[PDB]
Design a binder for this molecule. Structure first.
Ligand SMILES: CC(C)C[C@H](NC(=O)C(F)(F)F)C(=O)N[N@@+](C)(CC(=O)Nc1ccc(C(C)C)cc1)Cc1ccccc1
Ligand SMILES: [Ca+2]
Length: 240
């Protein structure tokens, strides 16, 4: 997250860190959202490489024991059928990970609230992006969870030629674009939390930023719109 501030410990308890084994250790590659005790939602581009993955819930500092972490293996990866690695601008950047076991819920570990199907937010709705990704374009990962206030940019503005044009589809949510605050590499897969009816719900899965830079004026961060995928998500959980 560029232009973020540090989050409080139990502020975003559905946030997970998706990690892969790197030699002897484990490195953070992506965020995600805990949606069931044994299911995690993330971006499909996070699992394009065939690596050994684990999920960490109840995480706050990547490099220090917090006394709250649970570490569990990924047993099955279900990527959306239409995902195409060579065309992220086509959409379908979503994947569901079945965990090797059920995590224990507590004040640090809670399920993410999904929106009802078809829900579109109005322009400039209040949303927060969260993650441990790069804090500057070509910088380094955050050690502690960051958050940034990232209000939405509706589809008619986001797909206008001065913003992303044709590259954004209506199956995506755009948030930010002020040139200060954005998602950045390593925030991929994570939540965009938006306040709707007094409740924060996860409306986005972080998908891409400009190749020119993470915080670029009129290139808001782009998210998979979770409300476009509610039937697919429920059909995978109920059949697997
Ligand atoms: C791996 C891809 C699928 C998504 C990748 N995701 C992220 O970094 C995210 F923001 F979500 F956390 C991204 O935007 N990667 N970039 C590598 C940018 C990139 O390639 N983005 C991109 C944008 C649009 C498209 C469409 C037009 C095909 C493809 C890739 C990040 C970047 C940002 C600033 C400076 C340098 C690098
Ligand atoms: Ca830790």
């Amino acid at each position: 997250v560029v232009g973020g501030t540090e989050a409080q410990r139990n502020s975003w308890p559905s946030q997970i860190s998706l990690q892969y084994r790197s030699g002897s250790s484990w490195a953070h590659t992506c965020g995600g959202t805990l949606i069931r005790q044994n299911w995690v939602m993330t971006a499909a581009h996070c699992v394009d490489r065939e690596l050994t993955f684990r999920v960490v819930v109840g995480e706050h500092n990547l490099n220090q024991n917090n006394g709250t972490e649970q570490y569990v293996g990924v047993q099955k990866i279900v990527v959306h059928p239409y995902w195409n690695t060579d065309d992220v601008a086509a959409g379908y950047d979503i994947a569901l990970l079945r965990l090797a076991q059920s995590v224990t819920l507590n004040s640090y570990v809670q399920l993410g609230v999904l929106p009802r199907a078809g829900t579109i937010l109005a322009n400039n709705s209040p949303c927060y992006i969260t993650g441990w990704g790069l804090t500057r374009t070509n910088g380094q990962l955050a050690q502690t969870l960051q958050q940034a206030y990232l209000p939405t940019v509706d589809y008619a503005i986001c797909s206008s030629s001065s913003y992303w044009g044709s590259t954004v589809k209506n199956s995506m949510v755009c948030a930010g674009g002020d040139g200060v605050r954005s998602g950045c590499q390593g925030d991929s897969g994570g939540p965009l939390h938006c306040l709707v009816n007094g409740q924060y719900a996860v409306h986005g899965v972080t998908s891409f930023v400009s190749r020119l830079g993470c915080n670029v004026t009129r290139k808001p961060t782009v998210f998979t719109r979770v409300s476009a995928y509610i039937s697919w998500i429920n059909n995978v959980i109920a059949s697997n």
